[PDB]
Ligand binder design. Sequence first.
Ligand SMILES: [Cl-]
Ligand SMILES: [Cl-]
Ligand SMILES: [Cl-]
Ligand SMILES: [Cl-]
Ligand SMILES: [Cl-]
Lengths: 311, 311, 311, 311, 311
Amino acid sequence: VSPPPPIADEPLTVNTGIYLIECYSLDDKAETFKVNAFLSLSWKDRRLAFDPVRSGVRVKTYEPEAIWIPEIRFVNVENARDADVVDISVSPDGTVQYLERFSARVLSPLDFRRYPFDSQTLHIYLIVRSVDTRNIVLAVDLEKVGKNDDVFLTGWDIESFTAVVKPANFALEDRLESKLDYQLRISRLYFSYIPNIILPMLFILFISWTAFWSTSYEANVTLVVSTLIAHIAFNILVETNLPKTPYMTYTGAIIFMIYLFYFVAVIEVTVQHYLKVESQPARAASITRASRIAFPVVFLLANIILAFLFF
Amino acid sequence: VSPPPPIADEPLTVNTGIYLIECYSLDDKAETFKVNAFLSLSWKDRRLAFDPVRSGVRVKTYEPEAIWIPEIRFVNVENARDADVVDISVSPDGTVQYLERFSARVLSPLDFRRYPFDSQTLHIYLIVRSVDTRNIVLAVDLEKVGKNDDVFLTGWDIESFTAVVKPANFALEDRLESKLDYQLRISRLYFSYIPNIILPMLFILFISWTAFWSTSYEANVTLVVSTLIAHIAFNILVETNLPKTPYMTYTGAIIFMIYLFYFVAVIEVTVQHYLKVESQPARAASITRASRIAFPVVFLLANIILAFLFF
Amino acid sequence: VSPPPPIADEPLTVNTGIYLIECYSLDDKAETFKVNAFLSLSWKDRRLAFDPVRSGVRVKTYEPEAIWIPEIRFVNVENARDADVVDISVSPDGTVQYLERFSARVLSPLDFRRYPFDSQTLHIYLIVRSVDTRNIVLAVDLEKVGKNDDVFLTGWDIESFTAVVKPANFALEDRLESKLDYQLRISRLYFSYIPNIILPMLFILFISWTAFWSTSYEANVTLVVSTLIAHIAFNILVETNLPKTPYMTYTGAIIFMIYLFYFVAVIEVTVQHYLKVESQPARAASITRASRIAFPVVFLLANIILAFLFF
Amino acid sequence: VSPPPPIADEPLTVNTGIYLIECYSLDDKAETFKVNAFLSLSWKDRRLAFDPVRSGVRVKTYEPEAIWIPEIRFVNVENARDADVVDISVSPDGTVQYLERFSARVLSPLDFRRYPFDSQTLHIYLIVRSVDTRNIVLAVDLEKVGKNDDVFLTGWDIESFTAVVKPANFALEDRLESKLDYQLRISRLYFSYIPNIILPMLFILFISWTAFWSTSYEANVTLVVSTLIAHIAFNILVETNLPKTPYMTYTGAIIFMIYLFYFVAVIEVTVQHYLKVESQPARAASITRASRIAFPVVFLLANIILAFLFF
Amino acid sequence: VSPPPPIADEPLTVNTGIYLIECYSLDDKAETFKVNAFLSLSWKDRRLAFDPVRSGVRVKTYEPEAIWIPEIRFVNVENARDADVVDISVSPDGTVQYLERFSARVLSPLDFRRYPFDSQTLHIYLIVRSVDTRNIVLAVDLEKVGKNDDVFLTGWDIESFTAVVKPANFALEDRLESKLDYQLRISRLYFSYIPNIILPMLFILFISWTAFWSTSYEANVTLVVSTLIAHIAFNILVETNLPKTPYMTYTGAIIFMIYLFYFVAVIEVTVQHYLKVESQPARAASITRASRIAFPVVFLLANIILAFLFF
Ligand SMILES: [Cl-]
Ligand SMILES: [Cl-]
Ligand SMILES: [Cl-]
Ligand SMILES: [Cl-]
Ligand SMILES: [Cl-]
């Protein structure tokens, strides 16, 4: 089977449409997401036209083998989609109505700089390589584009499944290629963030600060070092629930600052001691009393600057 | 092969039935479960009818190729099912008796808010896309719906495999679609919950409370901080056995409250000390003696409120 | 091709036999095991019979397409087996000698209640669905059932590959089905159990008991709490080597009791102190001296009761 | 279905070209990377030549079956590529223009000796086995070699996709084989290295050094041992983000030196004590005061030697 | 197509040869290794013989369909190999020259008793099941057996790819089977063993021994228990880099002995104290002074006995 010849110097337009049946398995690491959906295509193959009175039928159904179907592919798929033809329906003028059900692991990039307040746009790029006998351009049939209301992505809000109606046609390896963009907007919904990650991580840091209402260097050391280990222990626990990135996340910035607040604390404790040791206990208690208000206020301000810096 | 024409303006009813052979691989994370089962279908194709005395046979067996079979699919499957035709049997009136054996990873959502007392309902949605020449509606043949007594899901009680006899018919991409709901009820059976998760997590919290029958700030600090690290260490150990959710679980609420009870404890210990340090040892021991009854009773009440709040 | 007609009202018997070539990949979690083996089948198709003098041949070899072969399947397989026909040989009386080489992930349940002294029986269930024209019953040909001497399952002793010659025939979806049971007996061989898991877990518990030959509440606390953390640390280390179950294991029972022996220990230490603190040092040292013999003996007895309870 | 006969004794040159569509899944462990790309090939099969006036066509398009295509393979692929023919175009002189779209997991080795400053060269080796009737040599058509601007490898800078135009021809199993080298240059971009790995690992080491401005052997021990455990705890946390190699990495060298700086520290602390214990408190404080400048300066120099040694 | 008839009562010899292209993915756990290679076969089918002057050709190339090819398989493969025919060449005497490129996950057993000094022999078993019309024996063509110089197995030294020229012919399911053994010798090259695993594990054990140059039971307890936790912590870190076996490894024996050296140490510390407590400080310091030389020397000897015991 060969492409349908053009009556005039015109390209064939293939009216696309993707309906998400079930969208799942979003790999925050691999920047992948698996989607099970419907692809719909329509074009005019005048060779396939018929007289309905003579044929005794209003619409003829054909097997993929039997007729010409355009080589539609995806740019950002891992390996080729696991498609299965659902229906092929030729109207008496030659307007083929194709529908397939596919499932493919897509590769859209993810940004976690604002984690756990991050929001994504998941791309699904449709392409069609123009043949040597006639060029092919894509088009979005807005009716045949949608999503099932039951489509669920646990911990995310599935905002909208839209499509840039504008196909960015370009040249590749001395041939025209028509490219459509299907964008799936999702926004994070991490509820348990504060009780699971921040709130307990804050208490461990606060427990460390009880070393300013103490003067025992033996108690002070246990207090600061022990809480530091408790901090690292808890970080190991929330390793799962955290973004594993080559850049700095919003949450990653907070965690880092907390490591520093342990470091500064130890300095205070060591100073408070070395002053008392060197018999200057005025400046010793002056520094401890200061820290009481200093450490918290500074932390608050720092976390404000920090926050606004990302948002 | 074309669909069977109606006698009048009626739709074709396809009598479904799923028999679970072996149900396994329930991913508590991915909200998936793999199932190996039998799909049975029945409809009336009057073209296929015969006079048994003339044909000399009671039932004729046909190859899938040879006769018309309806395109039945699943909505919530990951990738297409690994089906295989077992038998096709046409009775003398045209009633085709189809049977296939399949295996597919299903996507039903899971709720762990009541963990480890949670109970699920696992959905398997059957669909059939109506042809352009006649519409198709589904039906449940209650007899052909069941499960093998040996079907095992370790740590769960497989309650019932039922089906909502009511097919929710709807319109999609300008065509009718009939949808059936097959629900598999499972309820958790986590026996070792108390000895594996709660009982050792309780002892570690109690060990921390022995700081109210002490007055040594050096011992008190070691006691509370060390048990806090022991708590976090044990949490890392039961990380496996716990639900990894964006919402709060019943168990997750208990764990959180325990983090707080360490925080409050440290405050007590710091207060008991700062009072003794500031030479007010009456209010110092008053607070320690109070906590002895306070901390436990409060914890008990809190865990009662907590419990009833989920149940 | 259609089934071989009976002489009279008798069923066709298909003589089975499975020879394990290589048995591997036993998932203690998923309760699966992968097996690469030979399936052999024999039945009498009198239509296929020949006069060897006329045909000039002793045995005729046929292609699977060419002749009738019974639909043999497995009940507890994950997805369909990766079979490949090795040989089909018809003797002059019609006795077909079929042989295929397959590979399938089986689903037999595992019991770890006696871990690491547990022993399993791995089931491979063979079925054959009776046709509408004649019923089919299975049979074991003891000669064609065996295993390669090189079949290895690391850490297990492959005891015996046997088969219950009795096929449990039953009714399913209005038809007879013959079911054979192929059992593979394996017994655990965990040598390094004592040096890897128990022996170091015992020392950590003993180190904690050196708090009865001490009177320093500062030393006593460090001793008990630190060893408790060491205990939990080591439990995290042997998490791999341990059974992850919703029930109680033999080993899991020991581990739990050890958590309790830390709890009781802390009570002793706190009591020894609170008595010395309240100036009753007779009952203080009496309790410490007692524990010296008490804690060990009690532990021994408890571990005896415990052991006999499972065995 | 036979190769094109040579005009003279010269070999057939097949003009190659790979265009990376989407490059992803770089396994730092398995030394693999998955790539989805276009392979383009061109050669002259004079048998396929035509007179365009007589044939009434400018360019003839053929099915892979219909014409001779050279057996092109990859050396370093895991399993065979998931290729799909996009277009085959024969010009009137016999110049075949082949294009396929493939996806294969490649096996290029990785070197992490300079981690996280490492830079790789990812090899994709193209081969063609010379037939018994005529030899085949490869060639790079620089125009048909490139990459999509959107090709992303998270945490890496995709420098250049080049090809050594020189095909290294050699003999294998008594036949000529032409081998082309496609090199993909990538350089690491680990931004968060200092805040995620080094900076907190440095603070923990510094906290340990506060034992030189102390004289309490009880505090000194807690200080050094606790930080050592905090060190090991943090190493467990950054286990993910680190190279798991049988050789020494740059980072691995730093980590090792840090383990040693804890060891030397403990010696100091033990010495400072044993001197004070043996009533030689001049050499006791002399050693502590020394370490104050010693430990840091030595560490700095050591890390300089260390650094220059890899770079 | 049927097998080539013999001249007399002789068997057909098929000259084998495997050339490793890329050998990778060695699972130390699953005892598997994936290999991408060339399989070459040669036999004499006198039916296929030709007169080169009449045929006008030196060598004729045939499609797998067209001529008879022997059913060669592997014994220790997981699932069937992903083979692809590269070339079939018949010389004028009937000597067929077959070549295929395959990729299969092999199952050879591994021994880690001498870890990280272990050395393996990786088996690839070739078999051919003799037909009912003529028997088939295998043979090694030493020329067609080899490996690519670039074949890499990270952390191992690929010593030699050899083959036992002696095919172990045997009877299975009433038929002859010829079995060839292809052995791949590999020896471990774990360079970073000492700096990554032993050297830091030694320091942690030595840090514990600084309790013999101390008399503070409070310091002594912290010292020994803390280092024990540091030991367990480091063991968790090197869990990756270690062999997960049901038997005892060389390394596993060292680790165990170290657990014991902590146990003995605690006893010393407890004794040194209980003697000083019972006012016998001569035997108290005598035991501490002894241990100073005892513990190290004993450890050295023990590690010598230990070492020689495995080697
Ligand atoms: Cl695609
Ligand atoms: Cl489906
Ligand atoms: Cl099966
Ligand atoms: Cl390839
Ligand atoms: Cl094979």
